[PDB]
Amino acid sequence: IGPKRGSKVKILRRESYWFKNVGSVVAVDQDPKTRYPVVVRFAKVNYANISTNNYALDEVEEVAA
Amino acid sequence: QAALYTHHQYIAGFIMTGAFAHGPIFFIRDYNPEQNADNVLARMLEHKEAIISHLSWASLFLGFHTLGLYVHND
Amino acid sequence: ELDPNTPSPIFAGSTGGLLRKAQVEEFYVITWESPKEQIFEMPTGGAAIMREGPNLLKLARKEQCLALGTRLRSKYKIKYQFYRVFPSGEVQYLHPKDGVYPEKVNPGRQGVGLNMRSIGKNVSPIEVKFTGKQPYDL
Amino acid sequence: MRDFKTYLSVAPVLSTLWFGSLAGLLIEINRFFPDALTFPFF
Amino acid sequence: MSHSVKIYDTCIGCTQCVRACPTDVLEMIPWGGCKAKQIASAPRTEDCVGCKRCESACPTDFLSVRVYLWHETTRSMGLAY
Amino acid sequence: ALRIPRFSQGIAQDPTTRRIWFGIATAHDFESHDDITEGRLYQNIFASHFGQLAIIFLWTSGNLFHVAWQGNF
Amino acid sequence: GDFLVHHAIALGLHTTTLILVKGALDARGSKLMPDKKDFGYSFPCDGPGRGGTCDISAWDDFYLAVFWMLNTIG
Amino acid sequence: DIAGLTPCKESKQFAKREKQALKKLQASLKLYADDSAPALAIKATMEKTKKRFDNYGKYGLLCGSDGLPHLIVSGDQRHWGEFITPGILFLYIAGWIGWVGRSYLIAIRDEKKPTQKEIIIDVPLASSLLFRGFSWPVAAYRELLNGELVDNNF
Amino acid sequence: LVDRDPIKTSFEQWAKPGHFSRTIAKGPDTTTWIWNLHADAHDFDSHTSDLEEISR
Numbered sequence: 190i191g192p193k194r195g196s197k198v199k200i201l202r203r204e205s206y207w208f209k210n211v212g213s214v215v216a217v218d219q220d221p222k223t224r225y226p227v228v229v230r231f232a233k234v235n236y237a238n239i240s241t242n243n244y245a246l247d248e249v250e251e252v253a254a
Numbered sequence: 255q256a257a258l259y260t261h262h263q264y265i266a267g268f269i270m271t272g273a274f275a276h277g278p279i280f281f282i283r284d285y286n287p288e289q290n291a292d293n294v295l296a297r298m299l300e301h302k303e304a305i306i307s308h309l310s311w312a313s314l315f316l317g318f319h320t321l322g323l324y325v326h327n328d
Numbered sequence: 329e330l331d332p333n334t335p336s337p338i339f340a341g342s343t344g345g346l347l348r349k350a351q352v353e354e355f356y357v358i359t360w361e362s363p364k365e366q367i368f369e370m371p372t373g374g375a376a377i378m379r380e381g382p383n384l385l386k387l388a389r390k391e392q393c394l395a396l397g398t399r400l401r402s403k404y405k406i407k408y409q410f411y412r413v414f415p416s417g418e419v420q421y422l423h424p425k426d427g428v429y430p431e432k433v434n435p436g437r438q439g440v441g442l443n444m445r446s447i448g449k450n451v452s453p454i455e456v457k458f459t460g461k462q463p464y465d466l
Numbered sequence: 467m468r469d470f471k472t473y474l475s476v477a478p479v480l481s482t483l484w485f486g487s488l489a490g491l492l493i494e495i496n497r498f499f500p501d502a503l504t505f506p507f508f
Numbered sequence: 509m510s511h512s513v514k515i516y517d518t519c520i521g522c523t524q525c526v527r528a529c530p531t532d533v534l535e536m537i538p539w540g541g542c543k544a545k546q547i548a549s550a551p552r553t554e555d556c557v558g559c560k561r562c563e564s565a566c567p568t569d570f571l572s573v574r575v576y577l578w579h580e581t582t583r584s585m586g587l588a589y
Numbered sequence: 590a591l592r593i594p595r596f597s598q599g600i601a602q603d604p605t606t607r608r609i610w611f612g613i614a615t616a617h618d619f620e621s622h623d624d625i626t627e628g629r630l631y632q633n634i635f636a637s638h639f640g641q642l643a644i645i646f647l648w649t650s651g652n653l654f655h656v657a658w659q660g661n662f
Numbered sequence: 663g664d665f666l667v668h669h670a671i672a673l674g675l676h677t678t679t680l681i682l683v684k685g686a687l688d689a690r691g692s693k694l695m696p697d698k699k700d701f702g703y704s705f706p707c708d709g710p711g712r713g714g715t716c717d718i719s720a721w722d723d724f725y726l727a728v729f730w731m732l733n734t735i736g
Numbered sequence: 737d738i739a740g741l742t743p744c745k746e747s748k749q750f751a752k753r754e755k756q757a758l759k760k761l762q763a764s765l766k767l768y769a770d771d772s773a774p775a776l777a778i779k780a781t782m783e784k785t786k787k788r789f790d791n792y793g794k795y796g797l798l799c800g801s802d803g804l805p806h807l808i809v810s811g812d813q814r815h816w817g818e819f820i821t822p823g824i825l826f827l828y829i830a831g832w833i834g835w836v837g838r839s840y841l842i843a844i845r846d847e848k849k850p851t852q853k854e855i856i857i858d859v860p861l862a863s864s865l866l867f868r869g870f871s872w873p874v875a876a877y878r879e880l881l882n883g884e885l886v887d888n889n890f
Numbered sequence: 891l892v893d894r895d896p897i898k899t900s901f902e903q904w905a906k907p908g909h910f911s912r913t914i915a916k917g918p919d920t921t922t923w924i925w926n927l928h929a930d931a932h933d934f935d936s937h938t939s940d941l942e943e944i945s946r
């Protein structure tokens with residue numbers, strides 16, 4: 190806590206169910222390393238019975254900002 | 255005169271469909287999002303959820319409102 | 329057959345399994361271990377017993393002979409084992425090969441997962457017209 | 467016992483005490499004026 | 509393609525996730541870093557039929573597979589007999 | 590287990606009956622089935638519907654030919 | 663008499679086309695089937711699960727269309 | 737007046753309808769109720785469709801051939817409230833069905849776990865957001881298009 | 891299920907999303923389970939894995 194970790198993020202890929210909608214996050218990755226970090230989470234479910242997916246900062250367009 | 259308006263009404267309807275059906279094949283085998291975009295064939299795709307709705311809103315209205323008038327009448 | 333009678337997996341009759349197309353083409357068969365004399369469920373509708381030998385029942389087609397597991401592992405046992413019989417020999421060594429239990433690591437074998445480009449924006453439709461000179465045979 | 471900023475709940479089909487009734491009072495206007503097809507006003 | 513339906517996802521972890529599907533899927537082939545580190549989309553698929561039992565469980569987050577294979581053996585449909 | 594239908598290939602050695610039906614209804618799908626090139630295709634619809642106009646005159650001919658000797662005129 | 667049929671030929675090409683417009687307006691894909699392509703047209707069916715998925719190829723909406731082209735044109 | 741004929745003040749074809757047809761209603765020379773206290777064709781059912789005489793009110797009402805009455809409503813000669821009068825009425829009633837649709841809804845998505853409060857109903861009909869509709873003077877006709885549902889939220 | 895077995899309430903179960911297989915009607919909202927609930931309402935693979943009651 191000091192910058193911004195997981196406090197409000199849209200999705201922008203167009204495949205991901207809650208795509209353009211902004212729900213809440215959690216333990217976003219630490220290290221330099223990989224390409225699929227970030228958990229996100231929101232109320233609304235989706236086409237599977239369980240929906241709580243991980244997208245990745247190449248993108249999260251949050252966008253402003 | 256009455257088995258000749260229709261073989262030209264069947265067909266004609268029969269077309270239209272096929273018309274509408276080779277312009278949903280363009281979008282898959284051919285078509286090319288990077289080569290068409292901001293471009294008015296796009297936007298047509300892009301601003302699509304409305305397009306079916308302000309279409310479906312015609313039917314549902316044109317639905318029960320014809321059907322009030324015709325049972326009521328019966 | 330009889331003059332050679334080598335059995336293992338008890339049954340009696342049945343209009344279920346194996347018929348003409350398991351000679352003229354391929355064969356498929358499952359084998360296993362077991363503790364003490366126990367009555368089972370069966371593919372093809374029927375039902376019999378066990379004890380041993382090879383415990384080597386032969387089966388029509390291989391989706392059929394792994395379902396000994398989709399229940400025949402809700403009835404104890406590490407070991408169950410199905411191969412591929414021809415009308416003459418091998419290549420396709422079916423539960424043979426390396427390790428076993430689909431969910432471990434020795435090697436990687438095949439699979440891949442990607443095509444050219446990955447799941448990303450294939451709003452990009454079908455590209456080139458199919459023409460004998462640009463890497464789309466995979 | 468109910469004051470200000472929403473109240474107590476109610477069942478699955480209280481709509482069956484809302485189709486039947488309310489709406490039901492309306493036959494009750496469709497015999498007081500046993501007829502329509504335009505209407506005088508007040 | 510001849511069995512080409514994509515169930516991929518991103519975790520490709522397979523614990524309380526997915527196993528179901530007659531033979532086809534001998535995976536756990538750990539790619540150099542993807543959390544519970546087991547990945548991809550299949551092994552050698554020239555063996556079994558055309559499920560989507562394939563997802564039904566454990567994510568594909570996009571599509572999920574089904575029939576798309578066309579070129580279709582018989583061993584690849586119960587009935588060659 | 591032989592090889593047959595002369596254009597597709599997945600279809601061509603499929604041991605069932607699909608072999609048949611699906612033969613007689615991929616015929617006219619030139620764009621992308623084995624035998625095709627943007628050069629092939631086009632022309633392969635061109636001398637196709639020159640096979641058109643063609644069948645429209647064996648229709649019209651006979652239309653004017655069950656009429657001229659009987660069928661009052 | 664004509665102020666109805668005339669509104670019920672109008673509820674036809676509308677409904678017929680919400681489905682053709684739709685049929686077309688994503689042979690590309692959508693939420694349930696996002697990546698619905700490289701074959702677009704007639705891939706009829708898909709696996710059970712997701713919500714349960716079916717006649718959701720742009721052909722099977724064409725397929726579905728042809729009933730209202732056979733109900734207007736009537 | 738317009739395409740069909742004139743109202744009730746005269747409509748021959750219409751008259752014949754009154755008369756045969758209903759009155760055959762009659763049709764039962766007797767059928768026993770000389771004094772008897774049930775079988776009510778007798779009183780009204782006719783007379784309630786009937787004492788509807790050379791009066792029905794008077795309504796104008798155009799009446800074509802066979803003299804069943806047609807509805808123009810083009811706002812002229814007499815016929816205006818055969819659509820608008822009962823038209824704005826349809827508008828006003830609905831819209832205060834869904835003004836509150838967009839209400840015992842936009843009042844929830846908050847506080848603590850609000851995930852189906854709706855299969856039960858918090859205030860029945862809303863009975864709180866209730867009158868918001870008659871308590872629409874102007875309302876959405878401004879505050880819908882400016883602010884709240886504001887293009888922002890668009 | 892849960893509130894509040896077993897010995898400790900009379901206090902009846904009116905309020906707390908769901909019941910009927912176990913990542914049940916989930917917190918997370920949906921409609922399908924409203925035809926669920928009526929359909930298969932009577933059934934027995936759920937209620938309890940134990941005869942007993944059902945005939946009761």
Ligand code: CLA
Nearest residue numbers: 256257258259260261262263264265268648649651652653
């Ligand atoms: C409900 C019908 C509607 C009506 C009222 C008509 C009426 C007519 N059609 Mg017709 N037609 C229609 C739909 C209709 N058609 C459709 C949908 C098609 C194409 C799919 C055709 C294709 C067609 C052809 C080629 C011809 C006609 C002809 C005619 C006239 C022949 C007299 C008759 O009794 O037809 C009654 C209607 C029917 C018997 C139902 C249509 C069933 C048949 C004609 C189609 C089956 C053949 C198939 C398309 C081709 C097989 C190829 C094979 C033989 C090698 C008549 C005006 C003939 C003509 O105009 O005079 C020269 C000419 O033969 N039609």
Ligand code: CLA
Nearest residue numbers: 268269271272273275279613614615616617618619703704
């Ligand atoms: C006027 C012309 C026109 C032209 C030039 C084409 C051309 C084409 N269409 Mg097409 N189409 C049209 C109108 C046309 N279409 C119309 C009007 C419709 C619906 C209204 C369609 C619906 C359609 C579909 C679904 C498809 C095509 C496809 C195609 C392509 C392959 C053709 C094929 O599959 O036939 C091969 C068919 C046969 C050899 C015969 C089997 C056909 C059956 C269904 C018989 C139909 C009814 C029949 C007359 C009844 C039996 C007769 C009875 C008397 C016994 C080709 C590009 C395919 C495609 O490539 O899209 C990706 C395919 O998807 N079309």
Ligand code: CLA
Nearest residue numbers: 311314315316318322819822823826827830831833834837
């Ligand atoms: C009592 C009468 C009769 C009956 C049984 C119905 C029944 C119905 N009408 Mg309807 N209607 C009637 C007379 C009737 N109407 C009359 C006289 C008119 C005016 C000519 C209308 C104009 C009308 C419209 C525009 C619509 C309906 C719709 C409907 C459907 C109900 C949706 C609804 O109201 O939910 C409760 C209301 C809501 C959930 C909110 C919807 C908001 C709507 C009412 C917006 C109004 C704007 C409209 C275009 C007016 C133009 C104003 C403009 C000049 C700025 C329903 C089956 C809708 C439909 O067809 O869908 C199937 C809608 O399209 N009606």
Ligand code: CLA
Nearest residue numbers: 310313314315316317318319321673677680681726727729
């Ligand atoms: C006679 C037929 C039956 C009926 C009533 C419908 C009705 C409808 N079809 Mg449909 N359809 C049918 C047969 C029917 N279809 C068949 C046989 C096929 C092909 C196999 C299709 C293929 C088809 C397609 C592809 C589509 C439709 C769509 C529609 C809807 C279009 C909107 C509309 O017309 O107004 C609305 C509806 C009506 C006027 C019908 C009455 C509905 C209300 C008034 C019910 C009455 C309430 C009653 C009092 C309460 C009773 C319920 C209970 C409590 C007892 C409508 C619901 C389209 C759609 O989804 O629109 C958005 C589109 O998807 N249909």
Ligand SMILES: CC(=CC=C/C(C)=C/C=C/C=C(C)/C=C/C=C(C)/C=C/C1=C(C)CCCC1(C)C)/C=C/C1=C(C)CCCC1(C)C
Nearest residue numbers: 270273274275276277278279280281295682683685686687
């Ligand atoms: C001129 C006109 C018109 C019109 C109208 C119109 C003008 C109409 C149109 C129509 C068209 C159409 C209806 C079309 C359709 C189609 C489509 C829409 C398509 C689509 C698609 C798809 C699906 C995708 C892509 C591809 C395509 C494009 C194919 C008229 C005129 C007139 C009148 C009447 C009045 C009086 C005067 C006059 C002068 C006499």
Ligand SMILES: CC(=CC=C/C(C)=C/C=C/C=C(C)/C=C/C=C(C)/C=C/C1=C(C)CCCC1(C)C)/C=C/C1=C(C)CCCC1(C)C
Nearest residue numbers: 310314318502821822823824825826827828829830831833
């Ligand atoms: C107010 C009102 C009303 C009403 C009534 C109403 C208001 C009705 C409505 C109803 C509704 C409905 C009936 C709906 C339905 C729905 C549906 C039908 C759907 C379907 C679907 C879906 C869900 C989606 C898609 C799919 C499907 C199609 C399945 C009115 C009143 C009146 C009258 C009497 C007359 C005159 C005028 C007035 C005076 C004004």
Ligand code: SF4
Nearest residue numbers: 517519520521566567
């Ligand atoms: S998404 Fe499916 S099978 Fe794919 S990686 Fe996970 S569980 Fe493995």
Ligand code: SF4
Nearest residue numbers: 529532557558559562
């Ligand atoms: S999904 Fe496909 S590959 Fe997987 S099991 Fe089913 S058929 Fe086999």
Ligand code: SF4
Nearest residue numbers: 707708709710715716
């Ligand atoms: S459900 Fe649909 S898809 Fe699934 S099997 Fe049946 S048909 Fe096929």
